[PDB]
Amino acid sequence: STAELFRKIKNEKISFFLPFKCLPAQHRKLLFISFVCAVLSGGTLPFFISVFGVILKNMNLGDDINPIILSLVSIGLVQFILSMISSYCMDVITSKILKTLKLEYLRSVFYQDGQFHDNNPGSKLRSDLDFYLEQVSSGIGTKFITIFTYASSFLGLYIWSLIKNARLTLCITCVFPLIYVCGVICNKKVKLNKKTSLLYNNNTMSIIEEALMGIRTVASYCGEKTILNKFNLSETFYSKYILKANFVEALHIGLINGLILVSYAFGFWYGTRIIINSAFNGASVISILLGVLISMFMLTIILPNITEYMKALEATNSLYEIINRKPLVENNDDGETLPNIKKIEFKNVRFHYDTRKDVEIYKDLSFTLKEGKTYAFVGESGCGKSTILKLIERLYDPTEGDIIVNDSHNLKDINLKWWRSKIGVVSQDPLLFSNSIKNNIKYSLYSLKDLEAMENLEMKKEYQTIKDSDVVDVSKKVLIHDFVSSLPDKYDTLVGSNASKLSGGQKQRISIARAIMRNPKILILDEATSSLDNKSEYLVQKTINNLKGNENRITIIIAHRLSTIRYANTIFVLSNRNEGSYIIEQGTHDSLMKNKNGIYHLMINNQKAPNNLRIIYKEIFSYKKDVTIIFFSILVAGGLYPVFALLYARYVSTLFDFANLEYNSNKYSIYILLIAIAMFISETLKNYYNNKIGEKVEKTMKRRLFENILYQEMSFFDQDKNTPGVLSAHINRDVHLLKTGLVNNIVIFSHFIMLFLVSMVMSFYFCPIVAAVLTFIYFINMRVFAVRARLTKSKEIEKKEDPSFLIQEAFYNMHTVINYGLEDYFCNLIEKAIDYKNKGQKRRIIVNAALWGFSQSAQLFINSFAYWFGSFLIKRGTILVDDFMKSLFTFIFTGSYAGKLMSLKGDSENAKLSFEKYYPLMIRKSNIDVRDDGGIRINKNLIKGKVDIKDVNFRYISRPNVPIYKNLSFTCDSKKTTAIVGETGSGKSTFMNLLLRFYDLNGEILLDDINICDYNLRDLRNLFSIVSQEPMLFNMSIYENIKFGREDATLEDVKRVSKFAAIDEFIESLPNKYDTNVGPYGKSLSGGQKQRIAIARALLREPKILLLDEATSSLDSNSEKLIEKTIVDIKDKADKTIITIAHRIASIKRSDKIVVFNNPDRNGTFVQSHGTHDELLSAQDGIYKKYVKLA
Query: 563, 588, 606 — which closes off a domain?
Result: 606
Nearest to 150 by CA among 256, 47, 255, 43: 43
What are the C-alpha distances in Å from 818 to residues 143, 166, 205?
42, 73, 47
Q: Using CB atoms within 10 A of its CB, is residue 1075 exposed (0-12), middle (13-18) or buried (19+)?
A: exposed
How many CB atoms within 10 Å of residue 850? 16
Tell me the three-class secondary structure of 409-472, residue by residue. ECCCCCCHHHHHHHEEEECCCCCCCCCCCHHHHCCCCCCCCHHHHCCCCCCCCHHHHCCCCHHH
Q: Which positions ≥6 away from 377 have C-beta within 8 Å?
A: 385, 388, 556, 557, 558, 571, 572, 573, 574
Q: Are the C-beta atoms of 308 and 278 separated by less than 8 Å?
A: no
Task: Indicate the annotated binding residues for ATP.
Answer: 353, 355-356, 381, 383-387, 428, 501, 503, 505-506, 956, 959, 984-985, 987-990, 1029, 1085-1086, 1088-1089
Nearest to 108 by CA among 90, 133, 125, 87: 125
Task: Indicate the annotated binding residues for Mg(2+).
Answer: 428, 989, 1029
Nearest to 428 by CA among 526, 559, 538, 510: 526
Alpha helix segments (H runs only) across 60-122:
66-110
What are the C-alpha distances in Å from 450 to residues 421, 459, 707, 920, 982?
11, 7, 72, 67, 70
> What DSSP element (H or E) covers 977?
strand 977-981
Task: Indicate the annotated binding residues.
Answer: 353, 355-356, 381, 383-387, 428, 501, 503, 505-506, 956, 959, 984-985, 987-990, 1029, 1085-1086, 1088-1089
Query: Residue 523 forms beta bridges with which residues?
Result: 424
Q: Are the C-beta atoms of 274 and 280 separated by less than 8 Å?
A: yes
Distance CA(1171)–CA(917), nearest Å, equals 54
Distance CA(468)–CA(484), nearest Å, equals 15
> What DSSP element (H or E) covers 982?
none
**Domain assignment present for 1190:** yes
**Domain assignment present for 317:** no
Q: Report, in angstroms and rounded to the nearest whole number, the Rg of the chain calculated over CA atoms.
A: 43
- Amino acid of residue 10: K
Query: 576, 606, 636 — which closes off a domain?
Result: 606
* Residue 41, SS3 per DSSP: coil
Helix 1118-1130 and helix 1052-1061: axis angle, to 10°?
110
Q: Using CB atoms within 10 A of its CB, is residue 540 exposed (0-12), middle (13-18) or buried (19+)?
A: buried
Q: Which positions ≥6 away from 130 have C-beta within 8 Å?
A: none
Distance CA(203)–CA(235), nearest Å, equals 9
Distance CA(604)–CA(593), nearest Å, equals 7
* Resolution (Å) of this entry: 3.1
Sign of the dihedral through C-alpha 1136, 1140, 1145, 1148: positive
Nearest to 1027 by CA among 1152, 1142, 945, 1187: 1142
What's the DSSP call for residue 524?
E
Distance CA(1005)–CA(970), nearest Å, equals 10
What secondary structure does DSSP assign to 1105-1139, as a single string? EEE---TTSS--SHHHHHHHHHHHHHTTSTTSEEE
Domain of residue 368, residue span: 344-606
Task: Return the ∠ at Cα 997 (arms to 994 and 1001), rounded to 5°.
Answer: 65
Distance CA(415)–CA(1094), nearest Å, equals 67
Nearest to 590 by CA among 600, 582, 575: 600
- Amino acid of residue 650: R
Q: What's the distance, Cα to Cα, between the start and end of the chain in Å?
A: 71
* Residue 662, SS3 per DSSP: helix
Distance CA(221)–CA(223), nearest Å, equals 6
The rounded Cα 1128 to chain-centroid distance in angstroms is 53
Query: 559, 576, 606 — which closes off a domain?
Result: 606
**Domain assignment present for 626:** no
Q: CATH no. for residue 455?
A: 3.40.50.300
Sheet of 1154-1158: strands edge to edge? 1105-1107, 1137-1139, 977-981, 1154-1158, 1166-1170
**Domain assignment present for 388:** yes
Domain count, the chain: 2
Nearest to 1025 by CA among 952, 907, 957, 940: 940
**Domain assignment present for 616:** no
Alpha helix segments (H runs only) across 858-945:
859-874, 882-901, 909-918
> What DSSP element (H or E) covers 729?
helix 724-764
Give one word for 981, left, alpha or beta, with left for phi > 0 and alpha for psi -120 to 50: beta
Dmax (CA) for the chain in angstroms is: 132
Nearest to 762 by CA among 630, 901, 636, 641: 641
Give the 3-state secondary structure percentages of the chain, helix then strand then coil, rounded to 5: 55, 5, 40
Distance CA(891)–CA(895), nearest Å, equals 6
Q: Which positions ≥6 away from 1134 have C-beta within 8 Å?
A: 975, 976
**Domain assignment present for 642:** no
In degrees rounded to 5, what are phi and psi of residue 796?
-65, -30
What's the DSSP call for residue 377?
B
**Domain assignment present for 1160:** yes
How many CB atoms within 10 Å of residue 1065? 10
* Residue 1154, SS3 per DSSP: strand
Task: Return the ∠ at Cα 275 (arms to 273 and 278), rounded to 5°.
Answer: 110
- Amino acid of residue 866: A
The rounded Cα 1180 to chain-centroid distance in angstroms is 64
**Domain assignment present for 996:** yes
The rounded Cα 119 to chain-centroid distance in angstroms is 20
Distance CA(600)–CA(376), nearest Å, equals 13
Nearest to 424 by CA among 261, 294, 308, 547: 547
* Residue 1011, SS3 per DSSP: strand
Q: How was this entry determined?
A: cryo-EM
